[PDB]
Amino acid sequence: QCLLPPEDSRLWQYLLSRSMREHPALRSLRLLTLEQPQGDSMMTCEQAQLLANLARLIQAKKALDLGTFTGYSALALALALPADGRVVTCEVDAQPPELGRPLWRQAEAEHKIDLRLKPALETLDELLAAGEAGTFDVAVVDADKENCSAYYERCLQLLRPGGILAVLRVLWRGKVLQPPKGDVAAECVRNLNERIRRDVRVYISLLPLGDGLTLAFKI
Amino acid sequence: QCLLPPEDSRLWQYLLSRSMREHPALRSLRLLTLEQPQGDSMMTCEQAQLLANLARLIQAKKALDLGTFTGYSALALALALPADGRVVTCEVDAQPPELGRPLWRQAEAEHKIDLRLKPALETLDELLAAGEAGTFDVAVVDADKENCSAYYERCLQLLRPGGILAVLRVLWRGKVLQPPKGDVAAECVRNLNERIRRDVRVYISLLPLGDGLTLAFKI
Ligand SMILES: C[S@@+](CC[C@H](N)C(=O)[O-])C[C@H]1O[C@@H](n2cnc3c(N)ncnc32)[C@H](O)[C@@H]1O
Ligand SMILES: C[S@@+](CC[C@H](N)C(=O)[O-])C[C@H]1O[C@@H](n2cnc3c(N)ncnc32)[C@H](O)[C@@H]1O
């Protein structure tokens, strides 16, 4: 079900303590988020830092974040971007982003975070119909699993060559090994993994962080 | 001791099968190396692939590979570079590179791989004396632990801004937690981790691959 030990593992704690450089506002947002219903679905701190580091590495200016929740990944990305950077973040529930907004403000990153409260598929299609193919530097796919294939295809088209497409929670607690009959979400995660496996448009790494992290680098 | 389950476990095999894209020669090099005593000293295939992927991502042209062994990481890196790319690979033991060379040839990568048969510290000093500071794109530190702090510093100097410095085996089978008395290598690993943790010259991720993998991105 899970490749890594419990969070309380001493070796895991050492990994975190010897690597984490979490912004105070980001840290405050995480601790708040963990008290919320579905707080355990949030992006983990070391995943967010890896993605922010990669965004910084490639000098990203334009990021796309699917599944805002409380805005943890959006804020992590925003902090990796220069002053004129923008994160377009997509969500359907208005409540969770409003929990994170005060922390976006504290981090002086609220102006960098562009919240689009509508289904992600709608925002993706709009961006493309506006002719914004090949303009995004980083895309994070962490919304619903039902539409994740459509999300992957659209994010890939929105990324420039050399862009980074991250898909979160790709092992689905080990259910990808044999998705239960009628488990739409699990079948969807499994189907996308197969597609990405075959995709010659990208080169890829699958990492044992969180519930599995795919990094697909666009050619 | 380990953050990860055994390599042959079901979920790990899934992660590999859904991500791995070794060039046939690179695959053959791995399999051949694994027929040798201590063959599993080679870095795992997904670590080499992550490193090769990040090299490609940043359009690397020059790489440093400390601890050639049979040439697995050297070849992985070479395959991520353009025709005129170069990997300076450093090794003290003449025998293992002889094993890998036929696979370097099979991969059309011999002209890209620059083998320096002598202590890595000597090669690093030579490159710096030659005016190569700030010109390498990727540096992989996978030799002896006794000199790993010296390797880190020299590699950091040799890397350009935006370069990637990878340190392998940073958890040292959990001995970093409390290095046993007289365990000089474990103390060396522990000491470097504290320096990197504090190091303002880089931004960092520590990943639960192999025996721990540190990625330090140069500012
Ligand atoms: C796993 S959470 C995202 C975690 C978040 N990225 C973080 O950093 O903590 C999944 C989010 O996707 C949202 N979501 C579900 N369907 C969506 C859709 N069609 N479009 C956009 N967001 C959606 C959920 O409401 C939820 O907040
Ligand atoms: C863990 S193996 C490297 C594995 C290789 N990176 C791979 O991916 O397959 C460590 C290597 O460092 C070499 N080594 C030991 N001391 C060295 C030194 N002072 N300079 C260069 N290489 C050294 C060893 O002989 C050994 O081949």
Description of the structure:
It is classed as transferase. Keywords: methyltransferase, Structural Genomics, Structural Genomics Consortium, SGC, transferase. Helices cover 40% and strands 20% of the residues of chain A. The first copy, chain A, is of the alpha/beta class and 219 residues long. A seven-stranded mixed sheet of chain A has the order 3-2-1-4-5-7-6, sandwiched between helices. Chain A is globular. At the A-B interface, α1, α3, α8, β6 and β7 of A face α1, α3, α8, β6 and β7 of B. The site of one S-adenosylmethionine (SAM) has 18 residues of chain B, from α4 and β2.
Most residues in contact: chain pair: A-B, 43 and 43 residues
Oligomeric assembly:
homodimer
Q: What's the β-strand tally of chain A?
A: 7
Order of helices and strands of chain A: HHHEHEHEHEHEHEE
Main sheet makeup of chain A: 7 strands, mixed
Bound molecules: S-adenosylmethionine
Q: Supply the number of helical segments of chain A.
A: 8
Q: What name goes with the CATH superfamily of chain A?
A: Vaccinia Virus protein VP39
The helical percent of chain A reads 40-55%
What's the CATH topology label of chain A? Answer: Rossmann fold
Instruction: State the domain count of chain A.
Output: 1
Q: Sum up the overall morphology of chain A in one term.
A: globular
Tell me the fraction of residues in β-strands of chain A, as a range. 15-25%
CATH class of chain A: Alpha Beta
Secondary-structure content class of chain A? alpha/beta
The second-level CATH architecture of chain A is 3-Layer(aba) Sandwich
**Spatial order of strands in the largest sheet of chain A:** 3-2-1-4-5-7-6
Q: Cα-atom Rg of chain A, whole angstroms?
A: 16 Å
Cα distance spanning the termini of chain A: 32 Å
